[PDB]
Amino acid sequence: MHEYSVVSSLIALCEEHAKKNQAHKIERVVVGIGERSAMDKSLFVSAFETFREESLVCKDAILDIVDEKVELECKDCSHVFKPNALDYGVCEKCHSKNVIITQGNEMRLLSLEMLAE
Ligand SMILES: [Zn+2]
């Protein structure tokens, strides 16, 4: 969740995808960060520059961020959905307290531009 820890995880994640795609160099990494996320985009793009130099694979990668809407799950109520109103923070099937954000709380990878080995 903390920005430098997520980016350090991201560079390794970029490398594993490079192994999985049989690619040696990534030119662009695009991510999705939730609109109500527990993350700071300003430090995220600074941390990305700080860690990308550590690896040849990610060194020249262009970083782009897409803002995404949160997704919610209700503690056992079968409900996972994207909220559509100011009713964020509760389920809509019931309006029970104690629902949790499943997506949009932390960063996700959307696409990578890559050069084959
Ligand atoms: Zn519910």
Q: How far is the CA of 86 from the centre of ligand 1 (A)?
A: 16
74 is in an annotated binding site: yes
CA distance 77 to 46: 40
Cα–Cα nearest to 52, from 21, 30, 34, 26? 26
CATH number of the domain bearing residue 108: 3.30.2320.80
- Dist. CA 107 → ligand 1 center (Å): 25
Q: Which long-range contacts (CB under 8 A, 24 or more apart) does 21-26 make?
A: 21/112, 21/114, 22/116, 22/117, 23/114, 23/115, 23/116, 23/117, 24/57, 24/115, 24/116, 24/117, 25/56, 25/57, 25/60, 25/114, 25/115, 26/57, 26/58, 26/61, 26/112, 26/113, 26/114, 26/115
Place of tokens 């991510």: 31
In the reported structure, the alpha carbon of residue 106 is separated from the centroid of ligand 1 by a whole-number distance in angstroms of: 22
Method: NMR
Q: Is 2 annotated as a binding residue?
A: yes
Residue 13, phi then psi, degrees to nearest 5: -65, -35
Give the separation between CA 54 and CA 85, rounded to whole angstroms.
43
SS3 50: helix
Structural domain total, the chain: 1
Q: How far apart are CA 4 and CA 44, in angstroms?
A: 7
The domain in which residue 2 lies consists of 1-117
